[PDB]
């Protein structure tokens, strides 16, 4: 039972929950690989049994009637058909647990407040798009954001697979050049190549919201132009730097990830887009200041008249902080839900204590919980963490080509 | 072999050096514990044999007459005495390799430029003090800091260890109190109590330099005061916030870690203090802003007239950025060597490139290498790393009391 210390307070806990990890991680006694982003058939019944046992443990209903009975029909369902279908409430319980189990998510204090949209009966790129469009509008909610996941049908052998080709529902274009360099988002130049290579008319500028590439089983993808009224965006202004607005920066309201594979009780949902709301460093620090993203940091420091000739003026740090101030200020002025990294990390420490008494620990990936600016100014920095894989979970999956 | 990606640039390498990992860390395939701070002649023979092979590789004499002679010699001396002695050149090479191998050190671009003082003939605590004073004097060098290590006699059967009880050669007292609060550095309350109970007359300032507690084999520790003019200090001021000088903040020039164990070819040196020069975030962010250290952040933000009643104003990030500016400016004004986190991490990237060519990899602990502020603004943030233990090495050891 791994001993875990908080160095700011001096408190000690034990992660007894780690003793129940499934999928082995990338680390061995000889070398740690925790900093790696992507680490490198009756098996279905073992994972199905275990997920059902989880479900009835939570609702105080282990070791009695419906517990016994629910065990049998999945046995028979797999005996007869080879796969199985989840009860709607089990799908709800599995989705919240996969969120609860995400080691890299700092927002998990919210894990119990999740809206599960069941799309398991879907069957075309036209049905997808409507299900996706109801999500975005419910999730956006005029800027009062609400966490939501939409679950498309559970993959089965012999036939294709529902998949969304974009990494997220809202992405910005990335256009090449005579010189390779990109107008717009460099992280999306590739999926921008597939949209133009499928009928889409390439726009001009930096913040062109890409269309969707939606794929029903076996049939090729189909473009879908998102409605401008459905894609809520926030223009970026600074409370006291009047020229910041003139830089023409924007970001969208809804982070909705659409390339991860939801896995519950041995079943795989390659299309299950989930969404919440942004922590501000995600936008201001990574999306806008990463050298391989919008890379705006030097442009903002010039406007602030900072001395960029020597790193020791800390001009990168000063301009970064102001970009984050502008993100927080702009989202709040537009009445769009956002959380700063101080509030978010303090809530995550509260989640750690909750999960300690409820489950005896919590899988947390230190390198992703600590924010990308001002790390040691937040409490999670001084908190040791244990990382491991619990089920149900969100997994990465290959790109569909 | 582990594949390692840099995400800023897209490059990819394989850490083949990790396969030679001479010991075992705390991670298993079940669970990663990378974020934890604190993770027989036959075996002395094989450790020694491997170090000797390393030494003769570095001087391009592998498998030679002189190489096999030294193996037979070492084996003979372990049989006759249970231990063996390093040649002077072997000691210098082993001390540099220990620095080179240290996974949490961002300063390793410098590893070949290290001054090795051989104090293995030291006989008492009094001589030990003289060796240490000369180390401080050489390393400080009137502000033009030089990297050095002094190595005291190795652990040997029959006699006790040389130990320095202080965790660094220069530290500020931390005086307990009631109302419960610490005056001075709270990290040093325990050593401060030990000094008092060994006959030190305590001051009552916030930056009182502690005496040295030095243990000769099979002797109680002996108190030694450092001559005030040996301990170079830097009063902290800010280039534009003139009230900052009125805080009365100071820090010392020389970071000299004295409580670690140096291991070379199976031999152990429990007393071998080493020093380099500061990276400004260790002082500004950690030593001054950690809530459990000097904890000046809120007092600085109030003075800056920042809005401290809400976190989304990012008052903490703005105050910490100015504390770091003050540190860098104060040290440059005083002509005392200092490196900012941007230059340091950029030189660490060159070290990784050098090391990949030389040894096929480099042990690095991502969470220690990424600075405590402005993490993703530095290039080490976007570099994946492999953490593992090579020997020779600096190891932690328990406190002598
Ligand atoms: C409600 C507010 C939420 C906040 C503030 C939040 C915040 C974050 C942040 C900051 C990250 C890492 C940033 C990065 O990877 O660059 C992350 C990752 C993640 N989040 Fe959350 N999140 C929220 C809701 C959710 C929801 C609703 C789900 C799913 C139902 C979820 C599941 C995940 C997962 C699986 C990851 C891992 C990403 C990966 O491994 O690539 N989160 N979240
Ligand atoms: C010359 C300039 C140097 C710089 C800029 C530097 C930088 C650093 C920094 C920033 C840390 C981590 C501090 C923290 O924990 O917050 C560190 C750790 C460390 N340094 Fe360096 N260092 C230097 C010289 C040296 C030398 C000369 C040695 C040994 C001969 C050394 C050995 C180590 C070791 C062993 C650690 C790990 C400490 C631990 O594991 O607890 N360093 N270094
Ligand atoms: C629900 C939710 C809310 C939120 N606020 N942020 C989220 C961020 C991700 C995310 C997913 C994958 C991923 C990365 C971030 C980052 N790295 C930079 C590269 C690609 O991998 C996923 C879900 C989020
Ligand atoms: C030679 C050298 C130069 C330099 N500039 N810094 C150094 C820092 C350390 C260090 C050693 C141990 C350690 C910590 C830092 C940090 N944490 C805060 C708690 C205790 O563990 C050791 C040697 C350094
Ligand atoms: C190499 C390193 O693991 C990689 O850059 C990680 C670090 N921590 C992160 N943390 C978050 N939240 N998102 C990321 O993309 C990363 N990237
Ligand atoms: C718990 C956490 O791992 C711990 O506070 C670490 C994080 N990274 C660090 N990195 C450095 N350089 N120094 C430190 O003291 C720490 N502390
Ligand atoms: Cl994003
Ligand atoms: Cl220090
Ligand atoms: Gd101007
Ligand atoms: Gd001023
Ligand atoms: Zn690990």
Numbering used by the authors:
A (entry chain A): 68 to 107, 120 to 480
B (entry chain B): 68 to 106, 119 to 480
From the paper:
Nitric oxide (NO) is an important signaling molecule critical in the cardiovascular, neuronal, and immune systems. The enzyme responsible for generating NO is nitric oxide synthase (NOS), a P450-like heme thiolate enzyme that oxidizes l-arginine to NO and L-citrulline. Humans and other mammals express three different NOS isoforms: endothelial NOS (eNOS), neuronal NOS (nNOS), and inducible NOS (iNOS). nNOS is an important therapeutic target since the overproduction of NO by nNOS in the brain is associated with a number of neurodegenerative diseases. Thus, nNOS is an attractive target for therapeutic intervention. In our efforts to develop inhibitors selective for neuronal nitric oxide synthase (nNOS) over endothelial nitric oxide synthase (eNOS), we found that nNOS can undergo conformational changes in response to inhibitor binding that does not readily occur in eNOS. Here, we used a combination of crystallography, mutagenesis, and computational methods to better understand the structural basis for these differences in NOS inhibitor binding.
We first observed protein backbone structural changes with compound 3, followed by observations of the same structural changes in nNOS with many other inhibitors (12 cases in hnNOS and four cases in rnNOS, unpublished results). Compound 4 is a typical example, as shown in Figure 8, where the inhibitor can bind both to the active site and to the BH4 site in hnNOS, triggering backbone changes, but only one inhibitor binds to the active site in heNOS and does not induce backbone changes. However, the crystal structure of heNOS P370N bound with 4 revealed that the inhibitor still binds only at the active site while BH4 is undisturbed, just as in the wild-type heNOS-4 complex. One inhibitor molecule is in the active site, as expected, but the second can displace the BH4 cofactor in nNOS but is much less likely to do so in eNOS. The bulkier His371 in heNOS makes extensive contact with Trp74 and His461 in the neighboring subunit, while Ser607 in hnNOS has no contact at the dimer interface. It appears more likely that the tighter dimer interface in eNOS makes it more difficult to displace BH4 since BH4 sits at the dimer interface and is likely important for stabilizing the dimer.
